[PDB]
Design an enzyme around this catalytic site. Structure first.
Site, PDB file in Angstrom:
ATOM      1  N   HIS A  97      32.603  49.081  40.187  1.00 20.06           N
ATOM      2  CA  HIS A  97      33.913  48.759  40.746  1.00 20.06           C
ATOM      3  C   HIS A  97      34.996  49.573  40.042  1.00 20.06           C
ATOM      4  O   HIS A  97      35.783  50.258  40.691  1.00 20.06           O
ATOM      5  CB  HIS A  97      34.212  47.258  40.635  1.00 20.06           C
ATOM      6  N   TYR A 101      37.498  53.124  41.937  1.00 21.21           N
ATOM      7  CA  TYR A 101      38.942  53.350  42.075  1.00 21.21           C
ATOM      8  C   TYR A 101      39.323  54.782  41.696  1.00 21.21           C
ATOM      9  O   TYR A 101      40.202  55.377  42.318  1.00 21.21           O
ATOM     10  CB  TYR A 101      39.740  52.357  41.224  1.00 21.21           C
ATOM     11  N   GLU A 154      38.784  37.124  39.441  1.00 23.63           N
ATOM     12  CA  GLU A 154      38.218  37.952  40.509  1.00 23.63           C
ATOM     13  C   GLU A 154      38.154  37.294  41.893  1.00 23.63           C
ATOM     14  O   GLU A 154      38.016  37.993  42.900  1.00 23.63           O
ATOM     15  CB  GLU A 154      36.835  38.459  40.088  1.00 23.63           C
ATOM     16  N   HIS A 191      29.916  36.703  42.835  1.00 23.72           N
ATOM     17  CA  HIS A 191      30.237  36.588  41.406  1.00 23.72           C
ATOM     18  C   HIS A 191      30.934  35.264  41.091  1.00 23.72           C
ATOM     19  O   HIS A 191      30.646  34.631  40.077  1.00 23.72           O
ATOM     20  CB  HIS A 191      31.132  37.752  40.961  1.00 23.72           C
TER      21      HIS A 191
END
Ligand SMILES: [Mn+2]
Ligand SMILES: [Mn+2]
Ligand SMILES: [Mn+2]
Ligand SMILES: [Mn+2]
Lengths: 283, 285
Positions: A97, A101, A154, A191
């Protein structure tokens, strides 16, 4: 002295199913063709291009935390031997992740434009103080208090940023950049639930007295984080004019962050109050 | 000020890029490989040969569990670049895949109670438990350099006492899918040894000759002790089937690769021609 891990003698049935779900959801940023979004990208304003960099820049920082010290702290309070293996997959995908970006920046932005974004993230008051609160919990906090922070990060606070690519996806803008965020949310939704499930097991084993003591600190943390995020949202979205629509997007995800842990919803903000184009992006 | 966002357009060490690329491209799962097609050749084996296979994988399962849980965890805290920690997250996940892959082999080939029998023995082994104790003690207490040597010795050298068996059958065109799942593990561990061994040489050349002669002394002391105990575990398994001296030839051979990854010279004279040819056919195919 040491014991071997056995995937035939399952201790918790969820550990098997979550591994089978998270590994089969494996993905890489190098596969997705980002160069097809440059036609849409170049037709954005400075105001929009500036917003996008600061959004993905902020998420990069918060995904860096989870890959380095987040899941590393979470693995210490592990029940079964399989659960530590599932947290190893999780921790790897957090690094994926964080990396994704920068891959998005390599298509859209130049050398100096990237340095600008990272200079802004590393010095930002909202982000640096937000990681300051969360990483204090990972180093110092208990087994149950850490599992609360990860789900709040998250499954709730991360949606301050996710709003923007989802919004573009609804209008059919930047389909490939949002496709990366799509796969992050596909991972991050699991998650939250897995941590919330394990949190729920140890929470029920706590006595009546200590449950309400933790719930007290749970909602105190929830309010202080929303306090800080409101100022951060205003900084990003004021000049474009979505400030209030992102607020009704955060409170919607706070309810899910509660629900995964095994709690009643706090805010009355429904799915209909959320922007319908953003909600179409979700669908 | 407080924390730092990882930037992959600001790479400090260029090998972080390539090692991440290679390992992520080398992603795999045990659920893809069809193990049921090897039941035809698996059942064409005696009790002498069948019993050796479970003891081998089960013994390695202990050490892939050791690596996934605490092994890479120890290596992570002694990180140089932010990207290295990410690489280690990928490494640690793949170590769990290696640990799981053995369970898929047992499920297809063996029965419910036969699996209980294998795991019971590996957890009560005199050699493996002591072997894991020497390595984990280094991870828990050893310094940032000694832990890198132990992980390289572990998976680049003394893992191959176990790899000798499935590589032997692959050379005979037997147990193809059971070999491929081990073949993939060696592909990952070949890159792990190189990467961990490279970062070792960076911190090895920063020390003076004072501290280098001491570490090399501690290195070969650990090498001979692990080798002597491995000769006990080798004779504990391979004496009945009668490949004891071939596994010893294979152990001396791969010990040099563990040395070569850590930036040291090859100790033993055993080359590829000394090792069994059909096992070397298994590595190169
Ligand atoms: Mn994430
Ligand atoms: Mn997470
Ligand atoms: Mn391994
Ligand atoms: Mn390794």
């Amino acid at each position: 002295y040491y014991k071997a891990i056995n995937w035939n003698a399952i201790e918790d049935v969820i550990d098997k199913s979550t591994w089978e779900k998270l590994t089969e959801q494996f993905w890489l940023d190098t596969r997705i063709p980002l160069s097809n979004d440059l036609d849409d990208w170049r037709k954005l304003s400075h105001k929009e291009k500036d917003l996008v960099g600061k959004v993905f820049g902020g998420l990069t920082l918060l995904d860096t935390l989870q890959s380095e010290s987040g899941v590393d702290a979470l693995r210490k309070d592990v029940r079964t031997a399989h659960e530590e293996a599932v947290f190893n997959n999780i921790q790897f995908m957090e690094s994926v992740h964080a990396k994704s970006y920068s891959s998005i920046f390599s298509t859209l932005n130049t050398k100096s434009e990237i340095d600008e974004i990272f200079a802004w993230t590393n010095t930002n008051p909202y982000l640096q103080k937000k990681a300051e609160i969360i990483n204090e919990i990972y180093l110092n906090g208990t087994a149950l208090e850490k599992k609360i922070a990860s789900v709040f990060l998250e499954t709730f606070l991360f949606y301050s940023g996710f709003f923007t690519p989802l919004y573009y996806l609804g209008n059919n803008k930047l389909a490939n950049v949002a496709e990366i965020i799509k796969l992050i949310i596909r991972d991050e939704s699991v998650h939250g639930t897995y941590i919330g499930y394990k949190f729920q097991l140890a929470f029920n084993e706590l006595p009546e007295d200590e449950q309400e003591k933790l719930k007290e600190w749970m909602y105190d943390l929830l309010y202080t984080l929303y306090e800080n995020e409101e100022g951060y949202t205003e900084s990003l979205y004021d000049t474009v004019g979505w400030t209030e629509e992102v607020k009704t997007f955060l409170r919607y995800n706070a309810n899910k962050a509660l629900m995964n842990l095994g709690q009643d919803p706090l805010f009355p903000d429904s799915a209909d109050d959320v922007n319908p184009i953003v909600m179409n992006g979700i669908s």
